Structures are given as structure tokens and as C-alpha cells.
Amino acid sequence: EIKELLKLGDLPTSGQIRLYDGRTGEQFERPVTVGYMYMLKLNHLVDDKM
Amino acid sequence: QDVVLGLYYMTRDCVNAKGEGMVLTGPKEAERLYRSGLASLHARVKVRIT
Amino acid sequence: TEFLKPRLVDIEQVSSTHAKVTLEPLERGFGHTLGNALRRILLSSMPGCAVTEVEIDGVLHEYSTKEGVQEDILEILLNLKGLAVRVQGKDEVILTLNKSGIGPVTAADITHDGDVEIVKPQHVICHLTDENASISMRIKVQRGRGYVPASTRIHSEEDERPIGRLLVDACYSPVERIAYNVEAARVEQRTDLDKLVIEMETNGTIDPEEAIRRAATILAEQLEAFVD
Amino acid sequence: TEFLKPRLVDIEQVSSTHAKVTLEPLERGFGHTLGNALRRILLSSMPGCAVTEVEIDGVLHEYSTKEGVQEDILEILLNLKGLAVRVQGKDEVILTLNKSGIGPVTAADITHDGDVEIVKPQHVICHLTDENASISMRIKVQRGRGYVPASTRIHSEEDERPIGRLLVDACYSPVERIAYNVEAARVEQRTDLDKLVIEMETNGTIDPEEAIRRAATILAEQLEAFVDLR
Amino acid sequence: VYSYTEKKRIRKDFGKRPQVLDVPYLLSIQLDSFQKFIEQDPEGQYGLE
Amino acid sequence: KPLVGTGMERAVAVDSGVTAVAKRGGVVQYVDASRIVIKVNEDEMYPGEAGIDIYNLTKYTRSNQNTCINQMPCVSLGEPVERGDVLADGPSTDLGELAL
Amino acid sequence: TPEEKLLRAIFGEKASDVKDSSLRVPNGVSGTVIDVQVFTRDGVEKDKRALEIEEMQLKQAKKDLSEELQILEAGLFSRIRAVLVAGGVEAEKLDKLPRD
Amino acid sequence: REEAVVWDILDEVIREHPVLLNRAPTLHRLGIQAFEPVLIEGKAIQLHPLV
RNA sequence: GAGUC
């Protein structure tokens, strides 16, 4: 069902794309896994822990 | 981890690829070729090395 | 709007072939911008001169072994790709090697020729073992750009070569190795900006420093359109 | 041996934000070299105009609440940083937002000053509920390159501002999304010619052409150093 | 067939089975126990009583 | 809003009770970033008291861990809501949903 | 110490018998003072700061409960208007005439 | 008052001064090791991957 | 109460 959605998004079925290194402009020799992920910042602050 | 990965990647040998059976006079030339993208690191090759 | 202007500092010539140059200070991330763009052109756009073909009489193909010569045809081929030459005005030049007997055949034994300058007199080419071993040939040197293998010329060539015309991979680029390290430079108070340390190896004839100037120059010429 | 001179050729403008530009003729290798250098410089070193400072009357600090007002203080701050500005001759100016009564405030409601132009007049700022509710504010907008937050001004703060004045983080770089594509270019005979294809989206501010040219220029100046001293 | 908040944000359910009865108000345990302490119920011998 | 959820994010939000939920539903009379006042459906309205439900929102107070406690109103003025509609969100909450 | 005795005399700033006990911002942290609360003692007389902030509380209390009453009142009167409008069509001289 | 000359001199004292890094648990002797420390702004310490 | 292995 997931791959089916990827088709509907007009994306790669493995969710991998060929990317360019922003430093060099050299392409990565293999297409890489990207995508949106839900992230969180923890209560642990280097601010206080210093 | 990463160090291993990079090293393994370079050492590994692949079928033909870009420029199988080329001839190099020393290492530095290798690098030039790779950086121009007309030679993959995986290609089996003949080099003069001291 | 505040651009940064950097200036030249360190310039250690570890040898004539190899020079390390350290440069401060560069605005953030421009270390990489400049580092890479320079590298690319350095190697792969660099016009030069050098060996394209060879004709040895009695050596009509590149795989056989003539008695007396230690090395194979094939091996000596590649040695000679590396040998460095100075031309003046001329586009297409044929140098002659005649040599006999015992010894390593060196660059000096080539015919001097007016406009031509031989850079590395000491470069070993082949070893002739017994004195009865003799070699004669004509080595063709052209002007071109960068590096072109035999395979790319054979691509669109209606020019059919003759008996034992021996094409070799052409290494025009005198630039041998080039790389950049970017350590965060930290000018008094602003930490963010970075150092560009640049290691460069070249093929003798042209001095490392002069390489630099020429690279940036070519760059600039293209830039003409877009400054004004 | 004849080196090529690449010119500015095609200059399409799709949306007020978007613009395409092709640069032929290019030789091999330079497509990518220039492609990357361009991008870097474009984003970090593009001078842009953004909101620097703000005073809204009867509001001391960002966290409290004023009646009549849909958004929070912080959220309206956020709206305003993003708003697209074209200043003429002067480096720093203060625009006035004065609006009363029922309805939503667009940038349009900002009373318009001569030299200043609002690129996106229809930008949502704040919604006005109660009829007798109205607001007055003075918003300062400055020129600058890259990203300078408010916290770095408190960093070297000799400008100890009176309380009530609220300094804003500045998203100065107007370039929102930027890329290049090295494609083969149509010379009627020449095969070995490529074009650099410049895909670009910005917050209106800097005009496509103008942007690029200024980019190239500032780049070039750095190039002077290396070439001249040996 | 959904309320206004859901109309505003409907998430696409892939769930292949129907939850029959509803997810019970999770923080009920606390209230129910504490409420028992004060529960005015003559016969129910709990809490005060 | 979490793009990849389990649907459970709506229930989590609702139960935490840090949001404001509509007691009666009806139409929103006044919206403030501080007060949300709601006029009840005549259907549901008690003949005892007036049909006016009041939600003063809690804004920007100190949590135990030094965290911030900020409620944001979700609906707009003059809008329709029913019983149990999400009216104002707690800090880590989007329209109905848990937004960690 | 004897040294400090002489020095006091020399610069001539005697400095009264007091210690600096003031509350300072801990280092590393820095930000915005959003609100301040004070708790005076019952016995000792109030500070001007004390009064002005407790006066603020008065104003706030007043405004809040005043507008509570006002909006509730308007809704209740508007509800009575729905029953008088059934068996008694009159919209021109009710509204323009007084409320209570 | 954190003047920039302060930092210049600090750096000079810190030059060739090796400092010690420790992690719990201190299992064997290499739980503590010496490095030449180099100043970075920011509040986290940077370690070499190899160790 | 939570971090590390």
C-alpha cells in the first residue's frame, strides 16, 4: 500500500533519489533514501548541562 | 563504522564499470580520473607502482 | 553589505614539483565553493602538450618484444606518457630517438631540435641490455587539452592509421595532484570564517605558483560577460 | 587554442518569485564548477531587505496579550519578518502600520511611503475583531546579507534600546530555493556546447537578472586576490 | 460523515480492522477512585461511610 | 502536525485535557487570544441559566520542568462547532492532534 | 587587616555596615523578564512597587468580571427576546427603548 | 568583561598544555586520556572518532 | 525522576 502511494506521489518506489553533494556538485554514486520524518528535541539541554 | 565503509567501498571490485582495462603510470593519475568522473573506483586495472 | 578580502600568507615549496599554500581568511563556506571549482578546472580543462603516437621501425605493433630491451613495448609506452616537454610556436612536432648498445636510454639522447626544450634529462625510458640491441623511432607530440585516451579518438576517426602506427594515451595536463583542507580560521572575534590550505603537485616544467594564476585567469575571462 | 566566452542568454520570469536563466556557451566541466559556486554565493551573500525592529504601542514585551488581536505577539512578529520589501536609495527605513475597525490587515493597510515598495501587498498580517479595536505600530526595515538574528545584535549590543522596542530576527537572504542543471545547448553546428540552466525562486525582493549579475560580481572580486599576488 | 474539526483535518486511516467500541477516556481511573471516596451512598461501604 | 501518525494522536490530545473542548457547541461569538466565547445551540440550551459558555484560555505560564504552557485558539470567529470540538490547543497540539 | 584599615582612610569611602544580598541572574542563562509577583508580609507596610502591582490586580479583576457580567447579561436579555418575539411582534420600539 | 585580548593570552597558556578526558565507567587505564585541547565556541566538547 | 555504557 505504501509503494502504491509512492506511485501516486510520482516518486521512486524505493523512495531513493540521485542527489548532488552541495559541496562538490559531484552526484552520489548511489541514489539515497530521503523523506520526511517526525523529530523531537529532548529536555536535555547542553545549556544547563555545561 | 564510517571509516570501514569508505575503505570497503573503494577496495571492492566490480564488473567492467567505467574504464575496465586502463593503464596508469602511478596513483595520482587514478585520483584525477576518478575526480573527473571518467573512472569508477571499482574498475579492475593495470597500474605501475613503486 | 560587507565582502571579505583575503590576503596571501604561506607558500611552502616542499619541492619544485610540490607546493603547499595556506590562505586566509575566507568567508563561511566559500572555502568549499572555491576549493572545488578550482580543482575541477585545474585537472580536466587544462591545455597541454605531449606524446600522441610512436613509430619504431621494426616495431609495427605494440605487443611484441624486441630482444635486448628488458621492458615490453606496452610498459615503455606508459613511461613515456609522463615525460615532459616544452614547445614554442609550433603545433605538431616529431622528435627522433636513435640509440645503441648497453644502458638505460635517457631523455638526453633525443635530437635537441631548435624550438624544443627537453625538461627532464634524467627520465629513464627503456633499458637496452646487450650492445647489439639497437633502437630507432619517431615520437609524435601534439598540442591539445586535458586527457584523452586512445578510445575517445578511435570514436570518430576516419583517419585510418598505417602499419604499426602506434597510438598512445595523451596526457596533456601538466597538473598532477590537487586538494584542499578547510580548517575554521577564526579572525579575531569572528569564528565562523575559514582557512583554505591547498596542496598541489605538478609535472615539473610549470611552477606550482604559475599554475594558480593561470587557472584563476581563465575563470575571469568567462566572468567578463557577467561583471558588466 | 581558443577559449570560449560564455554569455548571459535566456532570462525567463515565471512567477514574481520564480525565474529561469540560461547561460551558454559553456564548455565541459565548467557547467558543474560554476553551478555549485553560484548556489553557495547566491544564498549566503545575497543582500536583501528584511524587518529589523518593531514598536507596537501599549505592548512592552512579546509574550503578553492585547485585546482585540487574533494572533499572539510572537506570531505576528513571525508574519512580518517574512514580508517582502523593496527599498530604494536609503539603507534603513521605518514604515507605519495604522489601521482601525473591522477586518483583516494586509500589507496594503500599511500606509505607503515614497521610496518604499511592498512586493507582496496581500500578505496576511493580523485580523481585527472588535470594531473599536485598532492598531498603531512602527516597523523598521533594514538592508543586510545572509542571516542575522536579533540575538546576535544583543551579542554586541551598544544600541541599548528602550524597553518597548522589539528587535526582530532577520532572514535577509531573499533566495528561497536555488538549483542548476547542466544540459546540452543548441548551437546550430557545434556539438561541444552546453548550457547552464539556473532554476530560481525567491521572495520577490531582488529581480532575477539583477541578482545574478551582482552575484557574479562579488565572486569575481575575490578572484582578484589570487591572480594578482603571484 | 464527520464533524467540523475532522472535516478540517482528516487523516487517512490504513487500519484494516474496525475498532468497535471507543477508546475509553484514559484518565478515568483516578477520578473514579477519588470520587468513590466522597460518594454519597448510604449502603455502599466505602470511603467516609 | 505529525504526518505519519496512528490516528491515536487525536485521542491523546483530547484526553490530556490541556486543550479546550466545547461543552455545548453552537456558534462562536467572540474570539480572543485569551478568551473564547460561545453561543449555544438552542436545542441543547438549559431553561435554567443563559446559553453562554465561557472559555478563558491559559497563556504562557511556567511548568515544573521549566517548560512553557501556551494555549492557542483553533477555530475562527463566527464559526460552527459541535459538542466535543477542539477549540483551543495546548502547546504540543495541532487542530485536534498531538503535535509533539 | 591593618592594610585595609589604612586604605579605607586613604580613599575615604567608609561604606556603611551592609552586605549585598541581591538576587542576580545565574550565568550562562539570559532572557526576558515577562512577569513579576510580590508577596508582602501582613505586618510590614507595602512598597510602592507593591501597591502599583496590586492595583494592577484590581484593574484586571474588575475588567475581567465586569466583562463577564456584561456579555452574560447581553446573552440572557437576547434570549428573553426570543420568547417575546413569539406571541408578540414588536421590533421597532422595544430595541430603541430601554433594556431592563 | 570578556575581552578579545583575554582569549589571545588564554590560548598561549593553553598552548602545549595537555588536558585530560574522562568517561564513566573508568574500566581500564584508557578511560582517562590526555589531549592537546583546542578551543571552540559552542557548549559541547569534541572528541576524536578513533578513541 | 532521567542520561551514559
From Swiss-Prot, chain B:
Quaternary data: The RNAP catalytic core consists of 2 alpha, 1 beta, 1 beta' and 1 omega subunit. When a sigma factor is associated with the core the holoenzyme is formed, which can initiate transcription.
Entry similarity comment: Belongs to the RNA polymerase beta' chain family.
Superkingdom of source: Bacteria
Coverage span on the entire protein: 504 to 553 of 1407
Native source species: Escherichia coli O139:H28 (strain E24377A / ETEC)
Protein name listed in UniProt: DNA-directed RNA polymerase subunit beta'
Chain's role: DNA-dependent RNA polymerase catalyzes the transcription of DNA into RNA using the four ribonucleoside triphosphates as substrates.
Lineage, opening ranks: Bacteria, Pseudomonadati, Pseudomonadota, Gammaproteobacteria, Enterobacterales
Swiss-Prot record, chain D:
Region (Alpha N-terminal domain (alpha-NTD)): 1-230
E.C. numbers: 2.7.7.6
Assembly notes: Homodimer. The RNAP catalytic core consists of 2 alpha, 1 beta, 1 beta' and 1 omega subunit. When a sigma factor is associated with the core the holoenzyme is formed, which can initiate transcription.
Keywords: DNA-directed RNA polymerase, Nucleotidyltransferase, Transcription, Transferase
Single GO MF descriptor: protein dimerization activity
The gene coding this protein: rpoA
Keyword Transcription: yes
Record protein name field: DNA-directed RNA polymerase subunit alpha
Function according to Swiss-Prot or TrEMBL: DNA-dependent RNA polymerase catalyzes the transcription of DNA into RNA using the four ribonucleoside triphosphates as substrates.
Annotated domain remarks: The N-terminal domain is essential for RNAP assembly and basal transcription, whereas the C-terminal domain is involved in interaction with transcriptional regulators and with upstream promoter elements.
Protein family per UniProt: Belongs to the RNA polymerase alpha chain family.
GO cellular component labels: cytoplasm; DNA-directed RNA polymerase complex
Catalytic activity: RNA(n) + a ribonucleoside 5'-triphosphate = RNA(n+1) + diphosphate
Organism annotation: Escherichia coli O139:H28 (strain E24377A / ETEC)
GO biological process: DNA-templated transcription
From Swiss-Prot, chain G:
Domain of life the protein comes from: Bacteria
Stretch forming the signal peptide: none
Family: Belongs to the RNA polymerase beta chain family.
Subunit relationships: The RNAP catalytic core consists of 2 alpha, 1 beta, 1 beta' and 1 omega subunit. When a sigma factor is associated with the core the holoenzyme is formed, which can initiate transcription.
Function: DNA-dependent RNA polymerase catalyzes the transcription of DNA into RNA using the four ribonucleoside triphosphates as substrates.
Protein name according to UniProt: DNA-directed RNA polymerase subunit beta
Species in which this protein is naturally found: Escherichia coli O139:H28 (strain E24377A / ETEC)
